[PDB]
Design a protein around this ligand. Structure first.
Ligand SMILES: Nc1nc2c(ncn2[C@@H]2O[C@H](COP(=O)(O)OP(=O)(O)O)[C@@H](O)[C@H]2O)c(=O)[nH]1
Ligand SMILES: [Cl-]
Ligand SMILES: [F-]
Ligand SMILES: [Mg+2]
Ligand SMILES: [Mg+2]
Ligand SMILES: [Mg+2]
Lengths: 160, 275
């Protein structure tokens, strides 16, 4: 596995912003909750590599669909609710350690497709105001989300 | 260390806290503590900038009093909020869409860095003010006890009665004010305004509010006086207003158009405090 000894699975998060400073809000498959696209690192790939794979796997965007604007310096961690840590599966993951990327969608909105996957994680998406995700994320992700949007805000505001 | 800023607008002092990039919950106990000038900060009202509840709006903000209760007065603190989110780099827009306890507004920051608010189309219908009257006229005659006088009346959500005075420190506001505030023809009372025309685009004024009396700044009365001084025909499209609390600039094209009000917001200080 790639979980470390403390119990954190390496992860990558994606904040996709458009020209108007909105960001992409994606709904989980067969669920009510929304979030930013995030995905687990795989054995042997770097963070950027994992980002591009998960970006196409769940959002259907290619390397030429986006441009990397920024990324966080080191990892941000959040512990899962101990009501949904599967204790029987070893080595069991208690949390996730993520590195976050801010991308700007350079293609049109039509290039988004959440069906590139046999096993889609998202069935819907929309543009939302920049700070909307900080309120509307699930609570155990909120401190990470606040820090990320705080770190990325200067870049997004400095565009049109 | 929770950061904050002191700001001043409409003659009142705001403590403004960025609760977007900060994890702070304002329980009424915490608010009461921060209201203390010695143990906490010391403010007249607390303005909290929050993430929006609606994905098409930019922010939501609340205002609490020193007692720890939420205040819901239309347009309150709008000027300081709009300047604050820009000063703190929370947004770079000039037209800010924001929700409050009284609904949603759109605030525009002019490039001289003052805040413009759209407050709707004023209404002179006496049935909506309300006003005991047969129908609308540019002025009215009311006999305040032993004294006759002429006024316009308009509604901007709240009732307003306006009289021309030839200088505002030459005003018997403390005797006349209460008599027309509680006048028979105002079943829901009215904010009376004493309007001293200096030029067709410059006005000094003092307001005896509906229940409080005179306050440093009443934005409702500033738009009301200018709203009729045009309907009466004595003022221009845009009018500078000078009240004890400061200066306001008002704009209105006449019926069929909404009235805009522009005012200042001054960034006093910045602050730390450990909770
Ligand atoms: N129930 C629930 N589980 C969560 C949530 N967020 C993270 N998960 C946990 O993290 C996993 C999601 O995987 P993800 O981080 O998107 O990466 P990926 O599967 O490699 O694309 C889930 O299987 C859970 O273990 C959530 O919001 N709700
Ligand atoms: Cl590709
Ligand atoms: F995945
Ligand atoms: Mg995912
Ligand atoms: Mg995935
Ligand atoms: Mg994966």
């Amino acid at each position: 596995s790639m979980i470390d000894d403390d119990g954190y699975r390496p992860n990558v998060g994606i904040v996709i912003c458009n020209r108007q400073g909105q960001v992409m809000w994606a709904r989980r498959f067969g669920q009510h909750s929304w979030q930013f696209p995030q995905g687990g690192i795989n054995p042997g790939e770097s963070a950027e590599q994992a980002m591009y794979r998960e970006l196409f796997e769940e959002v259907g965007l290619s390397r030429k669909d986006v441009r990397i604007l920024a990324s966080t310096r080191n990892w941000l961690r959040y512990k899962l609710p101990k009501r949904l840590v599967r204790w029987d599966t070893k080595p069991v993951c208690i949390g996730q350690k993520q590195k976050w990327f801010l991308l700007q969608l350079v293609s049109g909105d039509a290039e988004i497709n959440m069906q590139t996957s046999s096993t889609p994680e998202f069935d819907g998406w929309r543009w939302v105001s920049y700070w909307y995700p900080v309120r509307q994320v699930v609570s155990f992700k909120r401190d990470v989300y606040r820090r990320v949007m705080k770190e990325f805000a200067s870049v997004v505001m400095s565009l049109a | 260390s929770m950061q904050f800023s002191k700001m001043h607008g409409l003659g009142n002092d705001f403590m403004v806290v960025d609760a977007v990039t900060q994890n702070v919950f304002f329980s009424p106990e915490l608010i009461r503590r921060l209201a203390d000038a010695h143990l906490g900060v010391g403010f007249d009202q607390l303005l909290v900038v929050e993430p929006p509840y609606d994905p098409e709006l930019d922010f939501h903000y609340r205002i609490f009093n020193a007692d720890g209760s939420e205040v819901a007065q239309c347009g309150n603190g709008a000027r300081c909020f709009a300047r604050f989110v820009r000063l703190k780099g929370l947004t770079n827009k000039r037209d800010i869409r924001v929700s409050t306890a009284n609904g949603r507004m759109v605030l525009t920051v002019t490039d001289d860095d003052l805040v413009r608010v759209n407050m709707g189309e004023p209404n002179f219908e006496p049935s909506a003010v309300p006003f005991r009257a047969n129908k609308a006229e540019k002025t009215y005659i009311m006999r305040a006890a032993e004294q006759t006088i002429l006024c316009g009346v308009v509604s901007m959500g709240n009732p307003h009665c306006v009289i021309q005075v030839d200088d505002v420190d030459t005003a018997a506001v403390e005797t006349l004010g209460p008599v027309l505030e509680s006048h028979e023809r105002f079943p829901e009372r009215a904010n009376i305004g004493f309007m001293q025309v200096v030029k067709r685009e410059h006005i000094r004024l003092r307001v005896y509010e509906r229940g409080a009396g005179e306050t440093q700044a009443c934005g409702s009365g500033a738009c009301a006086a200018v709203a009729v001084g045009i309907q009466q025909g004595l003022l221009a499209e845009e009018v500078r207003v000078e009240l004890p609390g400061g200066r306001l600039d008002i704009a209105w094209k006449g019926p069929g158009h909404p009235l805009y009000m522009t005012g200042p917001a001054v960034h006093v200080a910045d602050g730390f405090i450990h909770l």
